[PDB]
Design a protein around this ligand. Sequence first.
Ligand SMILES: CC(=O)N[C@@H]1[C@@H](O)[C@H](O[C@@H]2O[C@H](CO[C@]3(C(=O)O)C[C@H](O)[C@@H](NC(C)=O)[C@H]([C@H](O)[C@H](O)CO)O3)[C@H](O)[C@H](O)[C@H]2O)[C@@H](CO)O[C@H]1O
Ligand SMILES: CC(=O)N[C@@H]1[C@@H](O)[C@H](O[C@@H]2O[C@H](CO[C@]3(C(=O)O)C[C@H](O)[C@@H](NC(C)=O)[C@H]([C@H](O)[C@H](O)CO)O3)[C@H](O)[C@H](O)[C@H]2O)[C@@H](CO)O[C@H]1O
Ligand SMILES: CC(=O)N[C@H]1[C@H]([C@H](O)[C@H](O)CO)O[C@@](OC[C@H]2O[C@@H](O)[C@H](O)[C@@H](O)[C@H]2O)(C(=O)O)C[C@@H]1O
Ligand SMILES: *[C@@H]1O[C@H](CO)[C@@H](O)[C@H](O)[C@H]1NC(C)=O
Ligand SMILES: *[C@@H]1O[C@H](CO)[C@@H](O)[C@H](O)[C@H]1NC(C)=O
Ligand SMILES: *[C@@H]1O[C@H](CO)[C@@H](O)[C@H](O)[C@H]1NC(C)=O
Ligand SMILES: *[C@@H]1O[C@H](CO)[C@@H](O)[C@H](O)[C@H]1NC(C)=O
Ligand SMILES: *[C@@H]1O[C@H](CO)[C@@H](O)[C@H](O)[C@H]1NC(C)=O
Ligand SMILES: [Ca+2]
Lengths: 313, 319, 318, 172, 172, 172
Amino acid sequence: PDKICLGHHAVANGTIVKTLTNEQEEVTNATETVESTSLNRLCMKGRNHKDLGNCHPIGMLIGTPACDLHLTGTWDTLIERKNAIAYCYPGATVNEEALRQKIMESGGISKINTGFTYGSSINSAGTTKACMRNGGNSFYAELKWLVSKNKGQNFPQTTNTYRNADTAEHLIMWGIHHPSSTQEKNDLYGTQSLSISVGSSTYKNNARPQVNGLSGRIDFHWTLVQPGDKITFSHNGGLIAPSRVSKLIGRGLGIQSEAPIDNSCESKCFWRGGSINTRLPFQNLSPRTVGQCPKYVNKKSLMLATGMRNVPE
Amino acid sequence: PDKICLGHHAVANGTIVKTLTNEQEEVTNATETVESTSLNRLCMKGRNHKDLGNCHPIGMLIGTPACDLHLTGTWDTLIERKNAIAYCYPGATVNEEALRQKIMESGGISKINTGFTYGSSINSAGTTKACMRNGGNSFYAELKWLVSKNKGQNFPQTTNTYRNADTAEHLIMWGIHHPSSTQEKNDLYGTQSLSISVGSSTYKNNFVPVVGARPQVNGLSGRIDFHWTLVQPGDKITFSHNGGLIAPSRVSKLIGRGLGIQSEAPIDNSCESKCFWRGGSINTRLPFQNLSPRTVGQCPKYVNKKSLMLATGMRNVPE
Amino acid sequence: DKICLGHHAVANGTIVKTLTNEQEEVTNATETVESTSLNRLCMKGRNHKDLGNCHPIGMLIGTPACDLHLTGTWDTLIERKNAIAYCYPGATVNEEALRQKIMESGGISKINTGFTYGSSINSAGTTKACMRNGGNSFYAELKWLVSKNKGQNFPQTTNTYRNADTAEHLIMWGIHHPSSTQEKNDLYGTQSLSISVGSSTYKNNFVPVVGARPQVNGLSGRIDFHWTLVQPGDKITFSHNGGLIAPSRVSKLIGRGLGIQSEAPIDNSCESKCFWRGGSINTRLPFQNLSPRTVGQCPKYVNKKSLMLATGMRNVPE
Amino acid sequence: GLFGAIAGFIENGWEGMVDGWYGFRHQNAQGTGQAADYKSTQAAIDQITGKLNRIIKKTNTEFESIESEFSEIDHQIGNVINWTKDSITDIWTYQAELLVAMENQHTIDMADSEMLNLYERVRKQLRQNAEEDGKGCFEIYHACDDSCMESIRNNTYDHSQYREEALLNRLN
Amino acid sequence: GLFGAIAGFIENGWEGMVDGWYGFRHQNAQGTGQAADYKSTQAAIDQITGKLNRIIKKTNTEFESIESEFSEIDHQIGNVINWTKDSITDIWTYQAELLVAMENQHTIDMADSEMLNLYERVRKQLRQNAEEDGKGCFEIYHACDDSCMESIRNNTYDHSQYREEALLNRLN
Amino acid sequence: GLFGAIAGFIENGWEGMVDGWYGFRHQNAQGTGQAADYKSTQAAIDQITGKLNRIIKKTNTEFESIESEFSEIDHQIGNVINWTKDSITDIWTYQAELLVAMENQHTIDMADSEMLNLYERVRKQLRQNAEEDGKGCFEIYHACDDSCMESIRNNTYDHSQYREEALLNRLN
Ligand SMILES: CC(=O)N[C@@H]1[C@@H](O)[C@H](O[C@@H]2O[C@H](CO[C@]3(C(=O)O)C[C@H](O)[C@@H](NC(C)=O)[C@H]([C@H](O)[C@H](O)CO)O3)[C@H](O)[C@H](O)[C@H]2O)[C@@H](CO)O[C@H]1O
Ligand SMILES: CC(=O)N[C@@H]1[C@@H](O)[C@H](O[C@@H]2O[C@H](CO[C@]3(C(=O)O)C[C@H](O)[C@@H](NC(C)=O)[C@H]([C@H](O)[C@H](O)CO)O3)[C@H](O)[C@H](O)[C@H]2O)[C@@H](CO)O[C@H]1O
Ligand SMILES: CC(=O)N[C@H]1[C@H]([C@H](O)[C@H](O)CO)O[C@@](OC[C@H]2O[C@@H](O)[C@H](O)[C@@H](O)[C@H]2O)(C(=O)O)C[C@@H]1O
Ligand SMILES: *[C@@H]1O[C@H](CO)[C@@H](O)[C@H](O)[C@H]1NC(C)=O
Ligand SMILES: *[C@@H]1O[C@H](CO)[C@@H](O)[C@H](O)[C@H]1NC(C)=O
Ligand SMILES: *[C@@H]1O[C@H](CO)[C@@H](O)[C@H](O)[C@H]1NC(C)=O
Ligand SMILES: *[C@@H]1O[C@H](CO)[C@@H](O)[C@H](O)[C@H]1NC(C)=O
Ligand SMILES: *[C@@H]1O[C@H](CO)[C@@H](O)[C@H](O)[C@H]1NC(C)=O
Ligand SMILES: [Ca+2]
């Protein structure tokens, strides 16, 4: 008798997958669902980006030399690097991490003049060797070091007030100079008792190592001034006064990475080690990622079957 | 030969659902699993509720004019509104959000007199134009503005102590006045150096009035900043001050537990609900919801999905 | 002639849930949720440390109750209910952060600060709150600095600790807040009190709060504790004119370990990788309805008494 | 589909059948007839009712607010809350899409299986008195009147009564 | 059920069968016999053992305490922790209920399929020498002794040997 | 397997078949032939393409950083972040393992079902002109040339043409 037989394809070299029932199930074909390989690059194609290089985000608001090309701008992506410089002159910012996170969340920075003017008894052009610009002594671009014009003389009681004329909140920063000796203090702001007062609607306020051979310190403070609101500085010396205030524009993605930029490849997912370009749903590179990312899993491999059971000859 | 044929029903107008295999699978019938429609109302049937309207929860503890009808009460549900008033006189509360969350978590407020008395050299009836009541200048109902009776004179060193005689923790609030000029400070509490000390078993702190020029808010450069702590049963709290203290005449007690809603939606006492958001109530029996990720109560889970159709019949195969 | 095909059955079948049916009888089923606990801490194969009456923070400042726990190594640290941290009334700023950091550690070592003081200062200030050998004493790792002559001004002093080690050190200090202006004048003099602390990465000022407050163990005084990490090679400087409780020793946290908060007694016979307030969980099962508060490698908490997993076919009896 | 009956060897459905999900059409001497199978229709509906009971449900867990609608919260914990909520929402969106996809696959296949099970029940009843046309019909090789047709639907057809007549008509 | 054998065309199970999950009962001239099918029984047990290996397991992830048992936690982060834990618990409770429901459905249906697969194996072996009784039995149309019955169970029955006798008895 | 065809009553697959997933081999007088079934092969591939479209996909949810890479974070909120991320990772690892395990089970069984559905389509076509060999072949009881074999594969075989010859050869 004539016979007609039904049958299915097979392959010599099949792939092992897991099922509900069996841990070692041979199938004709399978595809990976977990990404294991990374690109040690930041794929910035189709992105209006900004690599701050040696500039620290806070440096953009106060205007450190290292940050001269980053005082203003717009971006959808901001890249911060390791050991980035914020302070040329030794000192720190109160609520440093809060400010950094706010800038790294932003989509740009615009600057507005305070318009602050000072008497002839005040020198607004105080400079230092810590903040070098064009080979000569300089200072923070967005701040002015106010000192008595005549050495030793009393710094006059001054009042400066900034009004937010805009329709969005402005970020105002200022510095307080802490000299290391009573002699230094007398030379700059005179013999009197020093007091700096800052007041707005929602805000109000009044031995150490050498760092680059300076025991002198400029500590930075900051607040938000809401639209229509004013902020008043009452000082008799020691205030580092803002010449410009900052405005943070829209939203953007903040990457902290050591990886070099590549403007050829595109990506929506980034980590310290670079970019992740996979179409795959899962990833075992890092649990610390930013952007639109595959989900982190504690798994080297997960093979998804794309063919029937393999039963070879 | 005679035939008997087996078959299944069909319908002209079938529904599209998704499967593991096919994104466009026609079935006889399907039902929605994600709620898309909202009630722009707060369904408060079966609930002893309290709409604070223009009153901010913190206003209940210090007694702002706007909050005069909400100084005490019981509720299982408390509704807070947008731009609600807490402070008539300009200023803020330290740990504001923690205090607000604690009140919104409560099931009522009771008031207890501190019994605080002052020397004849002190004026306890200090008022302001910021806090208007019956057309005349007034102050926070639950606090007293202590000032020197004679302008310019030194405010005397005073000690006031409140004991929690109750069997439950009491919430005591006080204010520190920060005047705008050195001249203002001298007029009210005298020329001396001002220090306010607060001490209990579990809490201790010092406050120094910050004097200095600042902008006007409702034509006032002055600031009254509010502080608060819990005093446990049997424990005492001692105020040592030489001027600048806004002293409590009453302390608060938070009673039981309740659900705190922040919504703009008007109340409806006809419908019942266990899930609320800014935009209203969610009454669905469905397991999922795409209205808001910010909900309170017993809620369907938020999903980034317009529609998810669950098949309730076989494949539809017409002729 | 007949040949009939069939399946087994049992008289006493088990009910399980399916996608389709809530009351499905099967031949056999197994539980997937653990309901039963061991009221013991299974500490076999673990170099452990039961702190008993000693609170973890007490180890750094040296409370009497913690005298046997000032140093040590462990992979597991057990903290108990009502454990004592402070003999003298007061608290630690960032208390919970410090407690979590100690409970995360695998041991503690101590290093001398070497701090010396002028003859115008008495370093041996003691109290009745901290009793040791029947007599008044103080925190083992700290010294209460007071004016040698009652009423006299406490001199402007500077003490600096350098981290000579190759790992971060945890330095703690106290600020005394006296209860009256009279008390403050007796101990540190009539002047305005200021304590400044400065390192590379840390800076702060502290002013003693003077003012009447209730007695706790018959004492209106308060000693509040502060702490920071000093990195290798870095120095930390204390500038004070009275009110500082100064460290005689700094702490170093060694490696990593598992921190348990439990009331359960120790058992060195059984092994476990999952613990809670009520004891240990040894189950092979994937889920658990004992507590949502567990530590270690644990089955996941579920709001479910029972979940029966079928291990046999539908039961259809005769 | 999996069981090869619905959208398989049965070409299409019957819009004219409104009193059931599955059923029979017959042709004999006396004419034509339609009827619904109750047992198979109910088995399918009871299984779907079961899914709805399990899926159309919420948790009874009470959740309080962790974000203020009308005030500003600390920026750092606000970012942590935003990250956690978006992560939880991605999990529930995934679980929702998978549940419905998986259930829809099961519903379609379960319905297919009930059709095949009715077909197999009839095939076994008719034994050697009928043959399969490949469209879901049985050609019956004996005079089968409305009583006989009713006995097939009601599962009371005795093959032995018509076997002699049927075996002769089949061999011819 | 999906495959229509267990709680289907096979009326009930056999409590008297203790050495296997599936098997045979026969009647011939010499009398009665019972036997378990090893291959089908083991295929079902091996698949269930597979599920247990995969499900009866915990993660090796080490978790520390974030809420103190014996001290008071900050109220704001305490509320955030309470919200996160309740959210994670709702996910695991849902995943647990679904896993077990889904697995139980598969176990019941997988067991049904192994019964049907044994039935189909026998039907094909007996070829034209037997007919289906509709209740899970085959009526064999030839003298089949305990050797013959054993050859059906052991999958070594040669239909061609008994075909002549069988075809005559069937046509009658 | 569930449907009993692949790794079941069909002993093994055909490495020599490269132009399809399922198909036919025949032997007649004129010799031997192989051919792929397009409809069954495409039904299986289209279902797998469907799974890949649904699984090989990411969420469009934008995530910001909550842990600083280059600075030290508060120890308490750092522990909360670590607890939340490890909890979310345990959920996604579980969901990933279950999805792939469940899909792989469905793919293997769906492929098994398409093999069985083709086998059943042919069995019904051949009607009484063929018998099942039990190993996935039909023994045809009439001279079936390359035209006839082609008509079986193309679903245009008319059983009535060869019935007389076939019924005689079967009864013998
Ligand atoms: C009539 C009187 O008691 N005081 C007159 C001053 O208030 C006045 O200076 C003007 O003060 C205005 C605000 O007035 C109050 C208020 O807030 O309503 C008046 C209250 O009696 C006083 N209350 C207490 C308890 O001291 C209150 C308080 O001093 C301040 O609010 C503290 O910040 O002030 C308004 O601010 C005007 O801008 C201001 O010039 C002077 C000069 O007209 O005369 C006083 O008799
Ligand atoms: C000598 C002196 O200046 N004062 C003595 C008073 O303290 C004493 O009043 C009694 O004081 C008791 C507390 O005494 C100590 C303690 O803690 O036991 C004694 C300690 O030496 C002292 N330590 C230091 C470093 O000065 C300590 C400390 O001053 C406070 O705790 C700081 O807040 O106080 C206790 O409070 C009794 O209830 C109280 O009657 C009287 C009577 O003897 O005069 C002095 O002897
Ligand atoms: C505004 C101003 O007066 N700037 C000074 C600046 C500061 O006063 C100083 O940093 C305060 O600590 O000092 C500058 O010189 C410092 C420089 O002086 C050398 O003589 C000496 O070797 C070191 O003290 C060294 O730091 C400066 O450039 O920083 C001058 C500047 O005009
Ligand atoms: C369609 O589905 C709905 C929702 O489950 C159900 O109530 C209704 O009975 C169904 N309609 C028909 C015609 O079967
Ligand atoms: C019932 O199930 C358990 C768990 O798998 C198993 O150990 C036990 O042996 C089973 N009992 C029988 C009678 O098969
Ligand atoms: C948190 O999410 C909401 C979503 O729109 C956003 O408005 C808010 O600013 C976010 N907060 C932070 C700190 O990014
Ligand atoms: C968190 O939950 C516990 C126990 O369920 C409860 O007692 C506590 O009050 C909650 N915490 C906060 C901050 O509400
Ligand atoms: C959180 O986990 C990371 C893992 O690399 C670890 O380095 C970090 O110290 C942990 N943080 C805390 C506060 O435990
Ligand atoms: Ca940790």
